Structure formats: structure tokens, C-alpha cells
Design an enzyme around this catalytic site. Structure first.
Site, mmCIF file in Angstrom:
data_model
loop_
_atom_site.group_PDB
_atom_site.id
_atom_site.type_symbol
_atom_site.label_atom_id
_atom_site.label_comp_id
_atom_site.label_asym_id
_atom_site.label_seq_id
_atom_site.Cartn_x
_atom_site.Cartn_y
_atom_site.Cartn_z
ATOM 1 N N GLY A 17 0.412 -3.768 31.540
ATOM 2 C CA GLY A 17 1.447 -3.259 32.452
ATOM 3 C C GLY A 17 0.769 -2.608 33.641
ATOM 4 O O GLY A 17 -0.450 -2.451 33.643
ATOM 5 N N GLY A 19 0.485 0.769 36.034
ATOM 6 C CA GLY A 19 0.731 2.215 35.982
ATOM 7 C C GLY A 19 0.622 2.858 37.347
ATOM 8 O O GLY A 19 0.369 2.169 38.333
ATOM 9 N N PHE A 21 -1.668 5.019 38.789
ATOM 10 C CA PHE A 21 -2.985 4.967 39.451
ATOM 11 C C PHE A 21 -3.692 3.600 39.406
ATOM 12 O O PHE A 21 -4.699 3.402 40.092
ATOM 13 C CB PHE A 21 -3.906 6.041 38.864
ATOM 14 C CG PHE A 21 -3.497 7.444 39.215
ATOM 15 C CD1 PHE A 21 -3.858 8.001 40.447
ATOM 16 C CD2 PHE A 21 -2.757 8.217 38.320
ATOM 17 C CE1 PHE A 21 -3.489 9.300 40.777
ATOM 18 C CE2 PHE A 21 -2.382 9.514 38.646
ATOM 19 C CZ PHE A 21 -2.749 10.057 39.875
ATOM 20 N N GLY A 22 -3.173 2.665 38.614
ATOM 21 C CA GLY A 22 -3.781 1.343 38.483
ATOM 22 C C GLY A 22 -3.230 0.565 37.302
ATOM 23 O O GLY A 22 -2.168 0.892 36.764
ATOM 24 N N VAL A 24 -2.962 -1.077 33.472
ATOM 25 C CA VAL A 24 -3.220 -0.815 32.055
ATOM 26 C C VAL A 24 -3.642 -2.149 31.458
ATOM 27 O O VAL A 24 -2.916 -3.142 31.545
ATOM 28 C CB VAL A 24 -1.993 -0.241 31.305
ATOM 29 C CG1 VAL A 24 -2.307 0.009 29.824
ATOM 30 C CG2 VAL A 24 -1.525 1.048 31.975
ATOM 31 N N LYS A 38 -8.193 -2.767 18.637
ATOM 32 C CA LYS A 38 -7.472 -3.094 19.856
ATOM 33 C C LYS A 38 -6.985 -1.795 20.484
ATOM 34 O O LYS A 38 -6.423 -0.949 19.809
ATOM 35 C CB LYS A 38 -6.291 -4.027 19.593
ATOM 36 C CG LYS A 38 -5.821 -4.758 20.844
ATOM 37 C CD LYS A 38 -6.751 -5.914 21.184
ATOM 38 C CE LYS A 38 -6.249 -6.707 22.381
ATOM 39 N NZ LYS A 38 -4.873 -7.283 22.249
ATOM 40 N N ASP A 126 8.798 13.366 33.153
ATOM 41 C CA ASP A 126 9.015 11.946 33.455
ATOM 42 C C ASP A 126 9.493 11.172 32.221
ATOM 43 O O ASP A 126 9.088 10.035 31.982
ATOM 44 C CB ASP A 126 7.733 11.316 34.042
ATOM 45 C CG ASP A 126 7.988 9.979 34.755
ATOM 46 O OD1 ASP A 126 9.101 9.740 35.273
ATOM 47 O OD2 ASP A 126 7.054 9.157 34.794
ATOM 48 N N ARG A 130 11.391 3.771 29.441
ATOM 49 C CA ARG A 130 10.215 2.982 29.842
ATOM 50 C C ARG A 130 8.879 3.698 29.546
ATOM 51 O O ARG A 130 7.851 3.035 29.449
ATOM 52 C CB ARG A 130 10.318 2.406 31.263
ATOM 53 C CG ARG A 130 9.384 2.897 32.350
ATOM 54 C CD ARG A 130 9.566 4.360 32.754
ATOM 55 N NE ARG A 130 10.764 4.531 33.567
ATOM 56 C CZ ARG A 130 10.971 5.511 34.454
ATOM 57 N NH1 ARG A 130 10.040 6.435 34.715
ATOM 58 N NH2 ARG A 130 12.132 5.560 35.097
ATOM 59 N N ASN A 131 8.921 5.025 29.380
ATOM 60 C CA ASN A 131 7.760 5.824 28.978
ATOM 61 C C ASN A 131 7.667 6.129 27.479
ATOM 62 O O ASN A 131 6.809 6.909 27.053
ATOM 63 C CB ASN A 131 7.719 7.125 29.788
ATOM 64 C CG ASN A 131 7.433 6.879 31.254
ATOM 65 O OD1 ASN A 131 6.864 5.854 31.625
ATOM 66 N ND2 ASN A 131 7.819 7.819 32.095
ATOM 67 N N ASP A 144 2.931 8.983 28.885
ATOM 68 C CA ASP A 144 2.987 9.112 30.344
ATOM 69 C C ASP A 144 3.207 10.536 30.853
ATOM 70 O O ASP A 144 4.068 10.784 31.703
ATOM 71 C CB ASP A 144 4.021 8.137 30.928
ATOM 72 C CG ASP A 144 3.731 7.763 32.373
ATOM 73 O OD1 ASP A 144 3.030 8.495 33.126
ATOM 74 O OD2 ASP A 144 4.262 6.720 32.762
HETATM 75 C C1 LIG Z 1 4.331 4.623 29.198
HETATM 76 S S1 LIG Z 1 2.557 4.467 29.492
HETATM 77 O O1 LIG Z 1 2.110 5.465 30.401
HETATM 78 O O2 LIG Z 1 1.936 4.309 28.227
HETATM 79 N N1 LIG Z 1 2.495 3.008 30.287
HETATM 80 C C2 LIG Z 1 2.427 2.994 31.770
HETATM 81 C C3 LIG Z 1 2.005 1.639 32.354
HETATM 82 O O3 LIG Z 1 2.543 0.559 31.569
HETATM 83 C C4 LIG Z 1 2.104 0.503 30.206
HETATM 84 C C5 LIG Z 1 2.730 -0.669 29.496
HETATM 85 C C6 LIG Z 1 3.909 -1.178 29.869
HETATM 86 S S2 LIG Z 1 4.304 -2.506 28.769
HETATM 87 C C7 LIG Z 1 2.797 -2.242 27.915
HETATM 88 C C8 LIG Z 1 2.381 -3.048 26.747
HETATM 89 C C9 LIG Z 1 2.954 -4.316 26.538
HETATM 90 C C10 LIG Z 1 2.586 -5.082 25.445
HETATM 91 C C11 LIG Z 1 1.639 -4.593 24.545
HETATM 92 C C12 LIG Z 1 1.069 -3.333 24.746
HETATM 93 C C13 LIG Z 1 1.417 -2.540 25.853
HETATM 94 N N2 LIG Z 1 0.928 -1.241 26.110
HETATM 95 C C14 LIG Z 1 0.209 -0.431 25.296
HETATM 96 O O4 LIG Z 1 -0.192 -0.761 24.200
HETATM 97 C C15 LIG Z 1 -0.114 0.920 25.761
HETATM 98 N N3 LIG Z 1 -0.679 1.904 24.992
HETATM 99 C C16 LIG Z 1 -0.793 3.003 25.792
HETATM 100 C C17 LIG Z 1 -0.276 2.676 27.005
HETATM 101 N N4 LIG Z 1 0.135 1.408 26.959
HETATM 102 N N5 LIG Z 1 2.157 -1.239 28.459
HETATM 103 C C18 LIG Z 1 2.561 1.768 29.473
#
Ligand SMILES: CS(=O)(=O)N1CCO[C@H](c2csc(-c3ccccc3NC(=O)c3ncc[nH]3)n2)C1
Length: 238
Positions: A17, A19, A21-22, A24, A38, A126, A130-131, A144
């Protein structure tokens, strides 16, 4: 500053995804036991609670010119963010009809997480569906830590407001808050005492709980520990 991980223990993969600052990114982290885990890598350490995102560590990569590239290492969330998950639930190929029980459980998990943070006087600032991320066991955690439709009119009672909005996102399974109201209209809409309307087939008891989060006076709003029990009690009565 003893949270750091040797950059060589980390392999970076494709983007998960985008974020603040950049990007993820997915990654593989080689752990102390020799195995590989993972991870998610964003391109908090005191917090320990199942419904709160744990920090695994930090890597500083060196760029080719020597500019720091800091990276935050978090657990991998198989099912991604809760908002997207709810949307997918309304489609045949995505998850099945999520029953009310599962939706309340998402609310309870979030309340548990927010109860933990509020008890340590930590403001989120926040909170939205979505967070909220979904673990592989399908338990939700909070992550987040300026989208106008989650901000309260005027503290942890600001967070309580946002949690009510989040409960509404979950109850509607991904509707944007306040259909037919623009962002610039929000302050006037709320100042006149209007609130998010009760969703279609959603219980009066549930709507009372979310409504209590949007009282004008933040002192009239319940604490996260009050909400958590109210939600737990409602869940147990089904
Ligand atoms: C709310 S946030 O600050 O955590 N954030 C902000 C930016 O977009 C990220 C995002 C969106 S959809 C996604 C994702 C999709 C499929 C499999 C794994 C995924 N993510 C993670 O495992 C993960 N773990 C820690 C952060 N993200 N990740 C999440």
C-alpha cells in the site's frame, strides 16, 4: 535506539500500500532463530497488546549518495486494511456475507486496542477503518499512529468520536461518512446538531453506542473502556 535491525537480515519485495511518507512494501526478515518471517516495511515499541500494531524494529539503509532511508518493520497482515475488506465482503469473489457477530467483533477488537492506548494516555489522532489492519487469525488491530469526516467539532474524546465513525464504516461495510455532504460543509452540518444516520438493518442498541461517541460536549462521551464493555455485552446477547 536498541530497536535497530541489521539491514542485511531484510529482503524487500513488492508494494503493499502507499503511506504518508512513502511506500509500504512486503519483506522477508531473517529472525534470531534462523527462520524467515514475512513482514511489512514502511519506507510504539513499548506497546504490547494483541489489538495494537507491534513494532518489530527499524533498519536504516544507506542510499547510493549516502542519504538515509529509514524503514519501519511491522508484522504482515494477510487480509490488509479493514476498509477494503468490508468492501470486498459486498462482492461474490471476496469474503462471504459477514454476519453481525463478526462486525461487532471487529468493533470490540478496536475498542480493546483503543482502551489500551487511552489508558497509557496515548492519542491516535487518525482512527478510521482504513487504519485498522486484519491479522491472519482475523483479529483486528489498530495502526498508523487530517480527513475532515473523522474529526470531532472541537483529547482522547476526539479519538472516541473517530471510533464511532469507524463503527459506522463497519456497520455500513465501507460507506464513506455523510453521503450528500461535502468536506467544506462538515463543520456547519455538525454545528447544527446533525450526525451520521442509523444504517439500514442495524440494531437500535448498536446505534445508541455509536451516537454516544458524537455528543457535542466531549465530557458526555463514554471512555473506551465503557464502550468496550457495551459492545462486548451486545455481542454476547446475540
Ligand atoms: C494502516 S498502516 O499504517 O498500517 N498502513 C498505511 C499504508 O498502507 C498499508 C497497507 C494498506 S493495504 C496493506 C496490505 C495489503 C495486503 C497485505 C498486507 C498489507 N499490509 C500489511 O501487512 C501491513 N502491516 C503493517 C502495515 N501494513 N497495507 C497499511
Amino acid at each position: 535506539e536498541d530497536v535497530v535491525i541489521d539491514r542485511n537480515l531484510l529482503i524487500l519485495g513488492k508494494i503493499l500500500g502507499e503511506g504518508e511518507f512513502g511506500s509500504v512494501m512486503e519483506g522477508n526478515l531473517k529472525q534470531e532463530d534462523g527462520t524467515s518471517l514475512k513482514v511489512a516495511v514502511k519506507t510504539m515499541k513499548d506497546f504490547s497488546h494483541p489489538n495494537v500494531m507491534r513494532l518489530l524494529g527499524v533498519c536504516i539503509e544507506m542510499s547510493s549518495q549516502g542519504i538515509p532511508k529509514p524503514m519501519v518493520i511491522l508484522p504482515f497482515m494477510k487480509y490488509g486494511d479493514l476498509h477494503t475488506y468490508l468492501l470486498y465482503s459486498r462482492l461474490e469473489t471476496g469474503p462471504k456475507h459477514i454476519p453481525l457477530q463478526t462486525l461487532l467483533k471487529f468493533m470490540v477488537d478496536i475498542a480493546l486496542g483503543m482502551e489500551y492506548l487511552s489508558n497509557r494516555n496515548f492519542l491516535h489522532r487518525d482512527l478510521a477503518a482504513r487504519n485498522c489492519m486484519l491479522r491472519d487469525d482475523m483479529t483486528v488491530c489498530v495502526a498508523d499512529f487530517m480527513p475532515v469526516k473523522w474529526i470531532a467539532i472541537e483529547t482522547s474524546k476526539s479519538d472516541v468520536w473517530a471510533f464511532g465513525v469507524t463503527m459506522w464504516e463497519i456497520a455500513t461495510r465501507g460507506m464513506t461518512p455523510y453521503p450528500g455532504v461535502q468536506n467544506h460543509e462538515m463543520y456547519d452540518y455538525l454545528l447544527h446538531g446533525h450526525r451520521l444516520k442509523q444504517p439500514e438493518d442495524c440494531l437500535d442498541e448498536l446505534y445508541e453506542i455509536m451516537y454516544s461517541c458524537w455528543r457535542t460536549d466531549p465530557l458526555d462521551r463514554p471512555t473506551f473502556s465503557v464502550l468496550r464493555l457495551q459492545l462486548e455485552k451486545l455481542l454476547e446477547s446475540l
